[PDB]
């Protein structure tokens, strides 16, 4: 009319309408998960493989939204993912509940400044009262079952069938390097995929693990310097066709002898300069393997971009895809390279640990390539959850037993200070009842009776609804002795990011115009 060119529908009326419906529709396609349930969703983009996923991270990473209100939350989601390990759907659910509860306050007839002030006061009160429900704590990280219980509790959120063997393997792989005290890195653990048997035959191994065959000889010396290259066995001599049937044998024999002499001089110069082995990334030839066998030089076969990228980012060399024989400028720190036979396959093992910065690589094996993705996701999630950078994790009884207590505390605190700030406090307290409802609705029973039962027992804060059929209607269980706890800092960061996103959404709300060319 005066600013927009019949593109958007913004103005002095979409404040309590279009700016909330988009977020509601975005969060509606996410409440189906959140909990140990089988709600797989197929993802079809560009790979054209038809794979089903369960986590919301891969679902949100493939969906393309064209709305600023929906794009204002993916930034906070990525920030929370970069900060701590888990935590993604909680922020979205909290923001959706806050928006749905503020829609009524905006429709009644209240300004946004009072609502923002009340939300900030409620968030400050929740942050102040949060360090008060600490029950269990981490004792010694040098044991096995102490971290195995936490790993099992973290894995049970994803996979429900098998969760003990994977947790034990992750614990054994993490305890063989360095604990949380001192310094512990994350990009020092690699996951390899082996197409063979099922998942009931996995093992662990310290050092580098790569599925690369060897058609030469076993070189177990320390002077075998590595030499990575792009495509050294490509084609230094391009041969063409003269006639149709065949040409003269003299020219072909001369060209073959010249190429053989050239490659012999090349391998002699590359072996006499201080490099016994060579990393190739091309094809093979009969004379090539013959020279590699008669010169005692290890020759690989399998080539991959990820392998050379990891070798470059770990050692620090540089591939030289040149025709003329260059000089030795790829000196690294590796020296102990051994060969092993695993699953009738030849694997390499690198030994260069000096009790500092050790690496590990767990051996994984499955049926198809569409099943190891969830295993790798669970493994990396458990690895990220194990890192907390503190000796005492100060675990709290998660699963919804603390949300009701926090809501009751906020409700009891709000019924004291007079003024027009009680409605926002009551809304922030009632918004905390969105975690048990989503967990009860995704099981098979209702959620009103579960909430009534949870509010009718006692204010102990250690009661939550179970997962079996004998724990849906009563929902009276003690999760303190079972071993179901959550991260203390994770919930705090999630609440902080949700409050920040809600404040940013409620602030920027007026007229959405365009920009001139």
């Amino acid at each position: 009319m005066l600013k927009e060119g019949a593109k958007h529908f913004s103005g002095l009326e979409e404040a309590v309408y279009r700016n909330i419906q988009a977020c509601k529709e975005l969060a509606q396609t996410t409440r189906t998960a959140y909990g140990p349930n089988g709600m797989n969703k197929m993802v079809i983009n560009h790979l054209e493989k038809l794979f089903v996923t369960n986590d919301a991270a891969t679902i949100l990473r493939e969906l393309e939204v064209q709305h600023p209100a929906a794009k204002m939350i993916v930034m906070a989601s990525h920030m929370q993912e970069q900060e701590v390990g888990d935590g993604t759907n909680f922020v979205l659910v909290f923001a959706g509940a806050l928006l749905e509860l503020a829609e009524e306050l905006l429709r009644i007839g209240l300004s946004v400044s009072e609502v923002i002030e009340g939300y900030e006061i409620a968030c400050r009160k929740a942050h102040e009262i949060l360090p008060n429900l600490v029950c269990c704590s981490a004792k010694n990280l040098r044991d096995i079952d102490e971290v195995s219980s936490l790993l099992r509790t973290s894995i049970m959120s994803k996979q429900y069938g098998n969760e003990v063997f994977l947790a034990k393997l992750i614990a054994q792989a993490c305890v063989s390097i360095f604990p949380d005290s001192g310094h512990f890195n994350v990009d020092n653990i690699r996951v390899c995929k082996i197409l063979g048997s099922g998942i009931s035959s996995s093992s662990v191994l310290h050092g580098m693990v790569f599925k690369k065959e060897t058609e030469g000889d076993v070189t177990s010396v320390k002077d075998a310097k590595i030499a990575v290259y792009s495509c050294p066995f490509d084609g230094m001599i391009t041969e063409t066709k003269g006639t149709v049937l065949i040409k003269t044998a003299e020219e072909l024999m001369n060209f073959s002898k010249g190429e053989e002499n050239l490659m012999d001089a090349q391998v002699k110069a590359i072996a006499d300069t201080g490099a016994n082995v060579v990393v190739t990334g091309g094809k093979v030839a009969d004379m090539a393997l013959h020279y590699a066998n008669k010169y005692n030089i290890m020759l690989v076969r399998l080539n991959s971009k990820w392998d050379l990228r990891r070798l470059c980012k770990t050692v620090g060399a540089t591939a030289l895809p040149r025709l003329t024989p260059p000089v030795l400028e790829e000196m690294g720190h590796c020296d102990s390279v051994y060969l092993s036979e695993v699953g009738d396959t030849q694997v390499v093992v690198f030994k260069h640990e000096k009790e500092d910065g050790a690496i590990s690589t767990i051996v994984l094996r499955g049926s198809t390539d569409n099943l190891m993705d969830d295993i790798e996701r669970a493994v990396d999630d458990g690895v990220n959850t194990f890192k907390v950078l503190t000796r005492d994790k100060r675990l709290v009884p998660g699963g919804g037993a603390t949300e009701i207590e926090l809501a009751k505390q906020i409700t009891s605190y709000g019924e004291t200070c007079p003024g027009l700030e009680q409605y926002a406090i009551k809304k922030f307290a009632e918004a905390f009842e969105a975690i048990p409802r989503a967990l009860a609705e995704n099981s098979g029973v209702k959620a009103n009776e579960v909430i009534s039962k949870l509010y009718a027992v006692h204010q102990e804060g250690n009661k939550n609804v179970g997962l079996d059929i004998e724990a849906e209607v009563p929902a009276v269980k003690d999760m303190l002795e079972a071993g179901i706890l959550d991260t203390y800092l994770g919930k705090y960061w999630a609440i902080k990011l949700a409050t920040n996103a809600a404040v940013t959404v409620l602030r920027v709300d007026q007229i959405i115009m365009a920009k001139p060319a």
Binding site: G109, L110, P418, G419, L420, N448, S452, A456
Partner: protein
């Protein structure tokens, strides 16, 4: 579950019509006619009567409101608003899971708690003195009427109310509708209205010949069975010829002789007759030491059935020896004014006095009639229960606070509908604040924060300025039975509208 939604939609549509017609500062509606007319009025009952709907729920609500207005006479507007608010706050929020069972029990518990709270807050009063009653009547009648001669009218109405009560026997029955009417006669000074016996006689008695004067006789009225009939139960005599006409005289003479020989010892006077007037038979009837009157309408029938107690039955002769006519009754035909007036004093069934007013035109008649009506209604509503409650918007807040406290103390499962029906009682103060012209949020918050300290339940909102004032210094009080009846009617309407399943057709 779509019939209940369609019912509550029409209920809210009907309720959202006369919502802005409460309080001293009310709005004014206007209805246009299809022919080309427009009438502006501020009466909700007129709009409800002139409306035409098609939904059965709306017709049922209109009939309930009409019955409530006809039975009591005060409190027939807020019932629909309260019912609509309760419906919109309960069914339009607690029916997503379809469970119409515990809602009835919650409504019953809320009604019982409201009744208990309203009963445990009333204050006693005395009815010995008369100045307090007159002050209460003047304070309750100061709504939208003139102020010039209200004191005398209210005093006369109070006297008539205190004089019309005589049917006491343990149940306290008061009837003033069909027991006390209003009379009008122009001429004379306007400052002479009072109470009298009241006899509905204007120009019905006709005496062609001059006879004796009536001083203090003993009139014994009979029945009306002397018209153009064929006798008792057979067709042996029929009025067709002049011979039958002249034999009717002898038949009536024989009948009056039989009556005199049977049960005539106090010598009655006039008798009720519907048909029978001439210039020859009437002379013989007057000479037979008896008189007869004619021209009887519905007012005279009601007067002789209420004050005298005359019945209608097929039995003119052979009655009770002591039926009616017990006491010396004077019947002097006075010439005061311009018409014949009778003053039957001291007879059967006393305490049946009517009013006597001498105004002018029809405007004075209408104004004194409406003044007497509203004053008698106020007196009947006050004398029915000697308990007053400080209105204006102070008892509802205390009731809601008590209900919320009880719900928080019981810690039950159905606490959500209880809280929803308890928080749906602050509609009258919000409407008053909106009509006054102020903020409806800050004032409501201040009223909620004030009704929770220590001993503070008489602080309401002024209906003329827009501030919170104590009811102990203003003087706004309401009866107790009216609020209980309103709450019971609202609960019954909600229960009836909540128990509606499917609707079909039949014969």
């Amino acid at each position: 579950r779509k019939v209940q939604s369609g019912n509550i939609n029409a209920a809210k549509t009907i309720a959202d019509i006369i919502r802005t017609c409460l309080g001293p500062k009310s709005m004014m509606k206007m209805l246009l006619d299809p022919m080309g007319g427009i009438v502006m009025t501020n009466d909700g009952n007129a709009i409800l009567r002139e409306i035409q709907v098609q939904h059965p729920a709306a017709k049922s609500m209109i009939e309930i409101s009409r019955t409530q207005d006809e039975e009591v006479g005060d409190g027939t507007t807020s019932v629909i608003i309260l019912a609509g608010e309760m419906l919109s706050v309960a069914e339009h929020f607690l029916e997503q899971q379809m469970h119409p069972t515990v809602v009835i029990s919650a409504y019953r518990k809320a009604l019982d708690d409201m009744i208990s709270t309203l009963k445990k807050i009333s204050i006693p009063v005395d009815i010995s003195d008369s100045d307090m009653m007159l002050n209460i009547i003047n304070s309750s009648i100061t709504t939208k009427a003139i102020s010039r001669w209200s004191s005398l009218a209210c005093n006369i109405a109070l006297d008539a109310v205190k004089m019309v009560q005589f049917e006491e026997n343990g149940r306290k029955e008061i009837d003033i509708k069909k027991y006390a009417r209003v009379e009008k006669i122009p001429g004379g000074i306007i400052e002479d209205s009072c109470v009298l016996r009241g006899v509905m006689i204007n120009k019905d008695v006709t005496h062609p010949r001059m006879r004796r004067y009536i001083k203090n006789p003993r009139i014994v009225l009979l029945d009306s069975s002397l018209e153009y009939k064929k006798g008792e139960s057979q067709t042996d005599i029929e009025i067709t010829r002049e011979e039958d006409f002249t034999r009717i005289l002898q038949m009536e003479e024989e009948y009056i002789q039989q009556l005199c020989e049977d049960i005539i010892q106090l010598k009655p006077d006039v008798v009720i007759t519907e048909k029978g007037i001439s210039d020859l038979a009437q002379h013989y009837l007057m000479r037979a030491n008896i008189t007869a009157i004619r021209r009887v309408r519905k007012t005279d029938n009601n007067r002789i059935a209420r004050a005298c107690g005359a019945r209608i039955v097929s039995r003119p002769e052979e009655l009770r020896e002591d039926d009616v006519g017990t006491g010396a009754g004077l019947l002097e035909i006075k010439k005061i004014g311009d018409e014949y007036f009778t003053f039957i004093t001291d007879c059967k069934d006393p305490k049946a006095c009517t009013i006597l007013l001498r105004g002018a035109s029809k405007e004075i008649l209408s104004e004194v009639e409406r003044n007497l009506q509203d004053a008698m209604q106020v007196c009947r509503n006050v004398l029915l229960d000697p308990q007053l409650v400080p209105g204006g918007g102070a008892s509802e807040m205390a009731v809601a606070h008590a209900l919320t406290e009880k719900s928080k103390a019981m810690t039950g499962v159905e606490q959500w509908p209880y809280r929803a029906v308890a928080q749906a009682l602050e509609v009258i103060p919000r409407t008053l604040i909106q009509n006054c012209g102020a903020s409806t949020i800050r004032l409501l918050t201040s009223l909620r924060a004030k009704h929770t300290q220590e001993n503070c339940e008489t602080w309401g909102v002024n209906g003329e300025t827009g501030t919170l004032v104590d009811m102990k210094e203003l003087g706004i009080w309401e009866p107790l039975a009216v609020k209980l009846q309103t709450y019971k009617t609202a609960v019954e309407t909600a229960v009836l509208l909540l128990r509606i399943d499917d609707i079909v057709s039949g014969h």
